[PDB]
Amino acid sequence: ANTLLGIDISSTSVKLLELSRSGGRYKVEAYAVEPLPPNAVVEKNIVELEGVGQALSRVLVKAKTNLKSAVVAVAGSAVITKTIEMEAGLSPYPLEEVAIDFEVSARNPERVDVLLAACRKENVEVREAALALAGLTAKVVDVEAYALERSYALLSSQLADTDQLTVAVVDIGATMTTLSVLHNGRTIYTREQLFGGRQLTEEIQRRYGLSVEGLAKKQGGLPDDYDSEVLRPFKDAVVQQVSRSLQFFFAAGQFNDVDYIVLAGGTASIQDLDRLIQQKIGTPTLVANPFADMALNGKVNAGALASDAPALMIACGLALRSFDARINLLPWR
Ligand SMILES: [Cl-]
Ligand SMILES: [Mg+2]
Ligand code: NA
Numbered sequence: 001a002n003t004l005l006g007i008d009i010s011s012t013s014v015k016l017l018e019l020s021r022s023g024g025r026y027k028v029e030a031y032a033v034e035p036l037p038p039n040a041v042v043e044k045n046i047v048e049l050e051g052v053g054q055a056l057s058r059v060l061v062k063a064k065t066n067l068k069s070a071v072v073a074v075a076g077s078a079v080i081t082k083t084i085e086m087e088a089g090l091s092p093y094p095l096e097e098v099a100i101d102f103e104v105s106a107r108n109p110e111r112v113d114v115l116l117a118a119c120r121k122e123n124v125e126v127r128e129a130a131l132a133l134a135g136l137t138a139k140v141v142d143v144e145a146y147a148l149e150r151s152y153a154l155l156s157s158q159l160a161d162t163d164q165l166t167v168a169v170v171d172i173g174a175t176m177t178t179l180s181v182l183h184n185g186r187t188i189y190t191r192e193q194l195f196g197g198r199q200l201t202e203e204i205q206r207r208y209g210l211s212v213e214g215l216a217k218k219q220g221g222l223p224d225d226y227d228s229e230v231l232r233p234f235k236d237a238v239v240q241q242v243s244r245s246l247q248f249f250f251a252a253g254q255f256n257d258v259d260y261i262v263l264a265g266g267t268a269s270i271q272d273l274d275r276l277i278q279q280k281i282g283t284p285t286l287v288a289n290p291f292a293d294m295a296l297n298g299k300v301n302a303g304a305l306a307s308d309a310p311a312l313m314i315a316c317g318l319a320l321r322s323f324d325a326r327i328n329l330l331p332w333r
Contacts, residue, residue, distance in 0.1 A: 053133025
């Protein structure tokens, strides 16, 4: 009966999500999004440990949750995910500094397929330390790619049956944008690039003489030229980026097109951004909403949650580890 907190640590904010399940129905018990100070996390690598710790503490109070066990994930250039084939029934740094986990051929039953995930131990230990500063304990250290898979299964209502489709998921962060293509529920392609919503926010800073503290993108209050000479060129830049990413996937595999394009991240909520992408690609594009078929707790604002929904895809997938191919990069004890 012990559930785990889904905690997504990005470059600009900490996202928490608590899930519960009863009678085959998921339920959002608690959630909160706490902003991180600048340069506290760079490219999903924790730089300022104390800063992340205090943000984790505040996101616990803001979410009003009493849980102390959490699921976190690692990502970046220090994280590897592969699929290796080897004989059945066997008995970045020197392995001594690498955290390794494995999980058990389709064509041939003489050999065996094994999923492999690895990273430097430092990336695990620091995240354990960050949780410790908030009084939290890591039960599962996962990989963001697999977390995206679990949250993707919750999008069957928004799409048919996700187990038969080829869907390109575009997670647009602030500094990083990730294209993940899922075939029949499993990831077959992944490509991260240095591009995100920071390009838009900074443009609003230098042109209208505003500070970094982002607020104008949500509430508004910008002059009438913003829609034409600022937001539109940025949306076109996002379109070109997504278009370029898809062309790389098509040239890498046997696929020439995808069935759907799912947008994730905070930047995915921009008005008609899904339409501009759908216009260019010619493929049905929708904003991710993993809370469509879920019940809701009383202390959770339905409106605020709906706005943050596509940005909570990673945090949602991490929280789904509370209920039973799974990876844990934590050392066995
Ligand atoms: Cl390990
Ligand atoms: Mg995000
Ligand atoms: Na809340």
